[PDB]
Amino acid sequence: DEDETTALVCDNGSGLVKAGFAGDDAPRAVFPSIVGRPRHQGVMVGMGQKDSYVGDEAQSKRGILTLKYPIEHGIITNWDDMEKIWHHTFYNELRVAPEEHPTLLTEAPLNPKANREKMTQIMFETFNVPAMYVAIQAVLSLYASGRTTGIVLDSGDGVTHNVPIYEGYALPHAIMRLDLAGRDLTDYLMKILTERGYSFVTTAEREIVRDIKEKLCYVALDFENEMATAASSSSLEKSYELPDGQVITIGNERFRCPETLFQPSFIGMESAGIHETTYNSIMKCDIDIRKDLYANNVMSGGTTMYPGIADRMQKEITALAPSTMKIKIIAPPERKYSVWIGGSILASLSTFQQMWITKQEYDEAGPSIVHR
């Protein structure tokens, strides 16, 4: 129990932090990855002067603060502001004292060696956690779907990745990163919806375009004769009621937004798209392992939640793969937390105890120890 209860799992994202206790089924804490700094001197009624704001209080009060994102494209870019988000996570969100809890953290696919050593330096030397561990994100997603070999298409708020994993070892030279994700996707909907003849003028109009994207957006299979369908004008249309009455209608654009993930050309991106990239990762891997990867395309991440994403991907890679092959696109329902759940499982596991980096290992080996 000492640490069976006690292991923490913190998944640091570009848009959201997911956090909680190893053992739980889902994150106890989910909140924006921002750190707000007040543009002016003054106070809220009853509070003192605050130097900084994090998560939802930074989002809610955004009009008087300069908002900053510590993690650009999955990589920690500002370490002063990240230690601020961690502090908030332990002390306010989970309300635990960190110096008696083992902490499993996550990093990104080709996270620079030096960063994995730096967050270890900050975990052990400024938070004084007993022990910690850094798992790679795609690797926890895979594992949370039971398996050990597969290829994960991972897509969240600032990055998309393909991480081919074989008997647990993520394959460095076959990993692909596509910098277009849910953030890019909300801003494109924004324009095709203002372009439908609308105005997201106040900040209460801006924010909810993102809630339109999440609730009403679709990834149609045969996106071709779906536009064609749009035109005959079926009961395909969908009206959402705004903060007030102002019933906005979205028929068609509803799927023009996730067609951006297959066609980056919709947004002036010259890069290849999700399905081709799944494939290219795969023809960059060893030959003998390619049947395995093909029957185990595990999807994780908030942006892979658009319904019919899996069917489109299913047919997208069948038709690029040699017919002798078995294609299989696994997309679980909890996928917006796969990464986290894979960490919860792993860290609560009976056999993981012997991989925890302890302060004994650290004080004796330097940050190098956990770096592997």
Partner 1 sequence: DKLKEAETRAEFAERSVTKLEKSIDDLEDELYAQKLKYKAISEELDHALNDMTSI
Least distance to its own copies from the beta carbon of 197, Å? Answer: 8
Q: How far is C-alpha 161 from the geometric centre of its chain's CA atoms?
A: 10
Kindly state whether residue 48 participates in binding its own copies, applying the rule CB under 8 A.
Answer: no
Residues in contact with 358: Cβ distance below 8 Å, sequence separation at least 6, in sequence order:
130, 131
Give the dihedral sign, CA 80/81/86/91.
positive
Q: Which of 34, 131, 331, 357 is in the footprint of partner 1 by CB under 8 A?
A: 331
Kindly state whether residue 322 participates in binding its own copies, applying the rule CB under 8 A.
Answer: yes
Q: How many residues bind its own copies (CB under 8 A)?
A: 38
How would you write 220-273 as a 3-class SS string? CCCCHHHHHHHHHCCCCCEEEECCCCCEEEECCHHHHCCHHHHCHHHHCCCCCC
Task: Report which of 81, 68, 140, 145 is spatially closest to residue 107, judged by C-alpha positions.
Answer: 140
Least distance to partner 1 from the beta carbon of 313, Å? Answer: 11
Nearest to partner 1 of 146, 168 (CB atom)? 146
Kindly state whether residue 80 participates in binding its own copies, applying the rule CB under 8 A.
Answer: no
Q: Which stretch binds partner 1 (CB under 8 A): 10-18, 59-67, 141-149, 304-312?
A: 304-312
Binding mask 282-301 for its own copies (x = CB under 8 A): --xxxxxxxx----------
Task: Report which of 296, 303, 289, 280 is spatially closest to residue 330, judged by C-alpha positions.
Answer: 296
Q: What DSSP string describes 128-160?
A: --SEEEEEEHHHHHHHHTT-SSEEEEEE-SS-E
Q: Which of 205, 214, 311, 361 is in the footprint of its own copies by CB under 8 A?
A: 205
Least distance to partner 1 from the beta carbon of 151, Å? Answer: 18
Least distance to partner 1 from the beta carbon of 326, Å? Answer: 6
Least distance to partner 1 from the beta carbon of 235, Å? Answer: 17
Dist. CA 38–CA 46, nearest whole Å: 17
Kindly state whether residue 315 participates in binding partner 1, applying the rule CB under 8 A.
Answer: no
Q: Which does 334 bind (CB under 5 to 8 A by kind): partner 1, its own copies, none?
A: partner 1
Side-chain half-sphere CA neighbours of 27 within 13 A: 22
Dist. CA 257–CA 180, nearest whole Å: 12
Site residues, its own copies (CB under 8 A): 63, 110, 112, 171-174, 195, 197, 201-207, 241-246, 267-268, 270, 284-291, 321-325
Site residues, partner 1 (CB under 8 A): 307, 310-311, 314, 326, 328, 330-334
